[PDB]
């Protein structure tokens, strides 16, 4: 053979591959190179025209190399939105009707997500990212693994990212928490399901680092989002800072912004120092041709600012920005955007050991070679990598210092949970009886959970030291009620309402898999064990003085091996969230700490509960 | 092209590869497949005949595929012992004379090592393993990286192992600590040197799991070593147990074994219970056709037993076993050996997710594809993997419980160190002044270090609470002196005598690299930062009641980025040792705890020192 395709001819002959997100990017190249390797490929994506173009290019290339009947080797599945369970079912039916059993599931489709800080991230947007990027991967595995096991072989490859972290270390990805969590979950799925899916099925993840074009000059869109986010953060922080030492309401302070005139605000002797200094910064550091140097904000930034203030408990009319003067384009000049873009690019290039951006083709080639390896499962392959970014090793204690524990005297504690009644009882009693907290607000899910805690804590309920709130599916409003009625918290300890499910994770070879964890149950797992913590953190990260502990699920000697796997899946995946929001919290004027406490280790009862109390105290006791 | 070599033709055309351990195993297959891929290969090994056979097989295969002048494509370097620095220099000269600059350094050679528990592992045997398996890798990199950087490209691949651990988690490998440490160091070298060697040079490791034949039915040799080790451990533990409640000297107890008669010992009413029960176990659980069921030991086991007793401070004549009756072959029958071998095999197969052993050819093929990837550095690729073995996440606190701290009253503390005078001063003062230890024995390297500590601790020296011993290069004898003169220790805190070197780790492109960390300096680094701790642990693991803390090097704001890299290299590599000896310590009757305390994190001064004190106390305070 002659030509670079030689390395490929026969490499994957006889295999059927399904590739989601197959019309462009790494997915299109994986589908191209698998087809050149002899596999029959189904390319799934939303846009019909781009899929048709990709299909025609691959078929033409196959013909050049000597394949016949190339129409039988490359099929497409257009209009496939992987965030829709119904459309994933249709994709599997279409693929099995075209080719029969699937050998390779290439879970490649991915959306960028909300691309906002957690405190600006709508809850439904976070959910959408999880459905598109993570739950879709489980869904397709659940539909195709039964046939793979029955035929005796199969392969599931999840296309994760360097920014999903590593097996025992988390990486923050600011303004991308939904994306990072989804990437971490794709990796965690391979790590924890491999022992169940073997020996018939291999499951691995790839985690490329930065790849050419993955931020779509190539960084101008990212640069503009960065500059818009900077303006939002600086305005919010100056308003919060001003409000600390000014008697006016937040409503009246925001009215100072309504002229939308940087020069006017700087010279307004009635404006608080922090807002006059901010305006001086916008002018001093701005581009005279950018309207951001003469105008404070625009409609989009104002909407996000208003939402932060509302979510932090400030009262303002919804129409407060309705008459805001619109700054003339450009809000940021091309000079400013290109400057920030060069900053982004130079930052990434400086982090790469090899000082060179891999291409989509390069990454796909390495991946298609890797797919030939029949002796690996449960691994995360890095087809590009070598980065100087700092990681946070996970899952490595004692009690905090006596001086920090004394700062809990008179504190207000929020505990969130329902299932873990023994933990909630003991933690409430430790804060109240050992460390002199003024009160504990117990936020549960249901009336039955409330009555259970009131019975366990009867003495403190009667004494007015334990209050109970029933949150249902409205945890944000429940936190609002607690703030209004009982005051802002110091310690906030967030445990999951729900236990882990007790269902099998794989089926017997000749079983219909009807009892195996369903696609809807996996979505519920994400809702109860990830989104629960995200919704609490999103609110508490606007609550000055809070120290938030996110607690992952318990495993006991009664727990099944499936529950141990799901606990480990959740621990890994939530660590991506915890690491990311920790960095984002450095940008608000509100001072908050966010830490994760894992109940499942790596495997009398009162000592295991006591170590939990100590771990929680270590991250919720403040410092003088 | 037709035939499985198609995937390879041209893949590595124009590359020159040096492969150590190239005459058999994975190394021979890597050399074969690189040659088929178009590379010119130099195969280095000890035995000339096996190398000549491998060379002839590869050249014949090249001719089949259509290469001409195959004698120019595959050279050999026989008689190459990679544990000899002089022979590595000769290998590089031979390779550059044959082919010019090397593109790929495949650091594949590896020896199994001592294959004994640490307490039975001669210090020179441990050193030999480090020279063959780890220091050799740095040495060849130091000789070939200058030419690689000058030409603008190169690749260094270290052939590590799953049993060298993972980036942020350690794996114990009992009876193989020297091997595991060497494998961890090969991985750590790639992790920490990649940022220095980029952008010109890629450096990665591979870490295969179990591979067919790697224990050389295939497990019978391992099985026999296991059974011999079991007999040694059970005899030693019964003697130590007997000595706790028997007034006779260890000399007199060992005399009870000299008839070498299991039945006689079981029925000897003058023998301690533990020894009569042991003999009953040997008979009851033995094979009547094995002489191990009727004889207590053989000359080899007796020699290792005598060395353990001598190393634990017991006085016995060197010739005590000189007249020991030799048990007739077989000592263990084929039935027993095959039984244990099936146990070993079934254990490994049960740990593999895919329930299938990869072959040498499979692993080599995956590796040769991986070598084509130009976008990865600093990674550990797993060409086989998916194992259920339990790992220990590293590098994740407070103070230990008041009840454990009270157990330090009246204790005897050993501190070992020299460079870290502030740590040693503060730790000694914490044990003596805060926790009421009876005495601290300060074991230093030199008279100057001794005088420095005596000056810092003058008050405690004058009061008779601080004793100093100068160990030089005789740390084992220094510990013996401390035990004899001051009593057995509780806490033992082992810090390195020496600081990390302050030299560059790479040279400028056109430099002669004359100031870069030399091959001898890297060997010294291993001696001072790894072997130091091994020698102390080897002795202290025979000292009942000790709690040993192994402390890795400090980095301060004054430390260079090179020192930060070397600290991280040492932390990773020593964690393999700490994890392994921790498991081995479960087999002795002596009760010892071994933990590792890392001074370098991931980056006023008195608070960093206070956190060190708390960390050390957390692992040296006993439990009621």
């Amino acid at each position: 053979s002659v030509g670079w395709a030689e390395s490929l001819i026969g490499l994957h002959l006889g295999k059927v591959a399904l590739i989601t997100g197959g019309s462009a990017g790494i997915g299109g190249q994986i589908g191209r190179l698998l087809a050149l390797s002899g596999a029959r490929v189904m390319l799934a994506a939303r846009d019909r025209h781009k899929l048709e173009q990709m299909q025609a290019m691959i078929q033409s290339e196959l013909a050049e190399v000597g394949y016949t009947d190339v129409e039988d080797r490359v099929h497409i599945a257009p209009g496939c939105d992987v965030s829709s369970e119904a459309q994933l079912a249709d994709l599997v039916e279409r693929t099995l009707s075209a080719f029969g059993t699937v050998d390779y599931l290439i879970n490649n489709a991915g959306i960028a997500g909300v691309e906002e800080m957690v405190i600006d991230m709508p809850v439904e947007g976070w959910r959408h990212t999880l459905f598109a990027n993570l739950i879709s991967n489980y869904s397709l595995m659940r539909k195709l693994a039964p046939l793979m096991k029955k035929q005796g072989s199969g392969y599931i490859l999840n296309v994760s990212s360097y920014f999903g972290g590593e097996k025992d270390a988390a990486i923050p990805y600011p303004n991308r928490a939904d994306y990072a969590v989804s990437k971490a979950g794709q990796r965690a799925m391979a790590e924890v399901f491999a022992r169940f899916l073997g020996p018939e099925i291999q499951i691995n993840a790839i985690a490329p680092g930065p790849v050419e074009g993955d931020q779509l000059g190539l960084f101008a869109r990212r640069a503009r989002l960065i500059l818009e986010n900077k303006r939002l953060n600086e305005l919010h922080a100056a308003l919060i800072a001003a409000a600390r030492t000014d008697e006016r309401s937040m409503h009246e302070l925001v009215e100072l912004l309504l002229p939308n005139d940087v020069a006017a605000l700087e010279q307004n002797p009635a404006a608080p120092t922090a807002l006059r200094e901010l305006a001086r910064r916008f002018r001093s550091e701005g581009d005279p041709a950018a309207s951001s140097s003469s105008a404070l904000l625009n409609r989009s930034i104002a909407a996000k600012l208003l939402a932060r203030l509302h979510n932090g408990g400030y009262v303002l009319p919804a129409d407060i920005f309705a008459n805001l003067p619109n700054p003339p384009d450009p809000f940021f000049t091309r000079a400013q955007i290109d400057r920030e873009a060069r900053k982004v690019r130079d930052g990434i290039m400086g982090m790469l050991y090899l000082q060179r951006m891999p291409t989509e083709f390069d990454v796909a080639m390495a991946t298609v070679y890797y797919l030939a390896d029949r002796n690996v499962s449960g691994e995360t392959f890095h087809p590009s990598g070598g980065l100087r970014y700092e990681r946070t090793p996970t899952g490595g204690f004692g009690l905090p210092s006596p001086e920090r524990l004394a700062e809990l005297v008179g504190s207000t504690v929020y505990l969130i949970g329902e299932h873990l009644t023994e933990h909630l009882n003991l933690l409430a009693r430790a804060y109240l009886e050992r460390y002199g907290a003024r009160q504990v607000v117990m936020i549960v899910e249901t009336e039955t959970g409330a009555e259970t805690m009131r019975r366990l804590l009867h003495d403190h309920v009667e004494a007015g030291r334990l209050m109970t709130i029933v949150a249902g599916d409205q945890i944000e409003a429940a936190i609002d009620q607690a703030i209004t009625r009982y005051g802002r918290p110091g310690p906030v300890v967030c445990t999951p309402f729900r236990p882990l499910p007790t269902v099998p994770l794989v089926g017997r070879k000749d079983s219909d898999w009807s009892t195996v964890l369903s696609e809807a149950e996996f979505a519920e797992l994400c809702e109860h064990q990830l989104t629960h913590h995200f919704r609490v953190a999103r609110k508490i990260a606007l609550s000055d003085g809070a120290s938030l502990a996110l607690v992952t699920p318990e495993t006991t000697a009664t727990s099944t091996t499936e529950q141990f796997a799901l606990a480990n899946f959740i621990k890994t995946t939530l660590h991506a969230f915890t690491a990311t929001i920790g960095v984002e919290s450095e940008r608000t004027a509100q001072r908050i700490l966010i830490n994760q406490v894992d109940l499942t280790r790596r495997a009398e009862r009162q000592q295991e509960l006591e170590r939990f109390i100590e771990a929680v105290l270590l991250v919720t006791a403040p410092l003088p």
Side-chain angles (χ1 to χ4, degrees), chain A residues 292-463:
Chain A
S292 62
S293 68
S294 52
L296 298 161
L297 51 65
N298 57 30
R299 295 294 179 85
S300 174
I301 295 165
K304 301 179 181 171
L305 176 61
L306 182 54
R308 289 196 182 182
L309 295 173
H310 279 157
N311 278 326
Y314 296 103
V315 184
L316 303 90
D319 66 356
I320 191 172
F321 289 125
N323 308 318
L324 180 90
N326 290 309
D329 281 348
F331 191 66
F332 302 109
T333 56
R334 195 152 100 271
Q336 293 176 311
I337 292 171
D338 294 347
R339 179 167 306 116
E340 182 63 32
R342 290 190 308 266
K343 186 167 162 187
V344 172
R345 173 199 61 192
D346 297 340
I348 292 173
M349 295 301 290
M351 289 297 197
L352 294 172
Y353 299 157
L354 302 171
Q355 299 176 1
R356 205 172 57 263
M357 193 87 52
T359 67
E360 291 171 351
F361 174 87
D362 294 322
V363 172
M365 186 68 68
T367 296
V368 172
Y369 287 140
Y370 178 70
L371 282 173
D373 184 339
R374 293 279 160 272
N375 291 315
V376 293
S377 192
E379 307 288 343
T380 298
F381 174 58
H382 297 263
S384 64
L387 299 98
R388 289 176 181 86
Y389 288 108
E390 176 198 323
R391 69 189 189 283
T392 303
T394 61
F397 53 77
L399 206 58
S401 78
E403 287 75 11
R404 293 180 56 199
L405 286 170
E407 222 63 27
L408 290 169
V409 181
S411 64
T412 296
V413 172
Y414 295 2
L415 303 178
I416 298 164
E418 177 139 319
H419 170 65
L420 297 171
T421 62
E422 223 186 347
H423 298 71
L424 296 171
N425 178 53
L426 277 178
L427 196 43
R429 292 187 178 275
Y431 281 121
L432 289 166
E433 300 165 17
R434 303 188 214 168
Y435 304 115
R438 177 164 67 83
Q439 55 176 346
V440 172
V441 183
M442 179 76 57
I443 303 170
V444 301
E445 186 183 10
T446 69
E447 181 72 28
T448 294
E451 191 66 8
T452 292
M453 296 315 302
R454 291 189 293 245
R455 174 194 57 85
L456 291 172
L457 290 152
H458 60 296
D459 47 329
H460 292 298
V461 170
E462 181 62 20

Side-chain angles (χ1 to χ4, degrees), chain A residues 33 126 135 144 218 228 230 245 286 321 339 360 394 478 511 537 541 604 607 614:
Chain A
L33 294 178
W126 156 279
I135 292 158
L144 294 176
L218 297 186
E228 292 166 332
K230 170 183 157 72
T245 57
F321 289 125
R339 179 167 306 116
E360 291 171 351
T394 61
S511 160
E604 180 46 58
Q607 311 182 17
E614 298 180 3

Side-chain angles (χ1 to χ4, degrees), chain A residues 148-171:
Chain A
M148 287 172 179
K149 187 168 177 165
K150 182 171 180 186
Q151 70 175 3
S153 62
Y155 201 120
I156 299 159
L157 187 78
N158 293 348
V159 182
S160 184
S161 173
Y162 169 84
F163 296 103
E166 306 168 347
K167 169 141 73 173
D168 284 304
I171 304 171

Side-chain angles (χ1 to χ4, degrees), chain A residues 409-581:
Chain A
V409 181
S411 64
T412 296
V413 172
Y414 295 2
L415 303 178
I416 298 164
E418 177 139 319
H419 170 65
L420 297 171
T421 62
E422 223 186 347
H423 298 71
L424 296 171
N425 178 53
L426 277 178
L427 196 43
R429 292 187 178 275
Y431 281 121
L432 289 166
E433 300 165 17
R434 303 188 214 168
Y435 304 115
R438 177 164 67 83
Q439 55 176 346
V440 172
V441 183
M442 179 76 57
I443 303 170
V444 301
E445 186 183 10
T446 69
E447 181 72 28
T448 294
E451 191 66 8
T452 292
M453 296 315 302
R454 291 189 293 245
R455 174 194 57 85
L456 291 172
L457 290 152
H458 60 296
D459 47 329
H460 292 298
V461 170
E462 181 62 20
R465 289 188 291 270
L466 192 293
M467 320 292 182
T468 60
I469 281 165
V470 176
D473 201 31
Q474 295 288 293
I475 185 67
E476 297 91 356
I479 291 168
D480 288 342
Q481 288 284 327
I483 291 163
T484 297
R485 286 152 57 184
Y486 306 119
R488 300 251 167 204
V492 180
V493 185
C494 182
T495 74
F497 287 151
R498 305 295 182 86
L500 294 170
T502 64
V503 284
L505 298 180
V506 295
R508 301 175 56 83
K509 181 186 183 69
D510 300 326
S511 160
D512 61 13
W513 288 50
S514 61
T515 63
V516 178
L517 183 76
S518 73
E519 302 92 333
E521 292 172 322
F522 186 85
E524 289 191 286
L525 173 76
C526 291
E527 179 72 31
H528 297 141
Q529 305 301 334
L530 298 172
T531 302
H532 174 77
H533 296 294
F534 156 81
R535 292 172 65 187
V536 171
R538 181 172 167 279
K539 285 287 293 189
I540 294 305
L542 295 173
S543 189
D544 189 52
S547 292
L548 172 64
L550 303 179
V551 181
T552 58
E554 171 189 59
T555 51
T556 68
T558 311
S559 297
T560 64
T561 193
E562 289 82 8
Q563 290 177 300
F564 181 61
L566 295 180
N568 289 318
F569 169 83
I570 289 302
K571 285 163 46 176
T572 296
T573 303
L574 194 71
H575 271 294
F577 178 76
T578 300
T580 296
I581 196 180

Side-chain angles (χ1 to χ4, degrees), chain A residues 71-138:
Chain A
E71 301 88 355
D72 300 331
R73 302 207 152 251
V74 183
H75 286 206
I76 62 169
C80 177
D81 181 349
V82 294
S83 75
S84 159
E85 172 62 18
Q87 293 176 40
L88 297 172
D90 290 336
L91 171 65
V92 166
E93 177 181 20
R94 184 185 176 83
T95 303
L96 298 169
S97 294
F99 299 137
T101 297
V102 171
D103 297 289
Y104 299 167
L105 167 61
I106 311 296
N107 272 321
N108 168 82
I111 64 173
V114 178
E115 298 180 287
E116 298 286 350
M117 295 166 55
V118 170
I119 56 179
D120 305 307
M121 176 177 295
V123 179
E124 274 308 314
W126 156 279
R127 289 195 181 99
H128 180 65
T129 301
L130 295 194
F131 269 94
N133 283 10
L134 174 58
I135 292 158
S136 62
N137 285 210
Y138 184 77

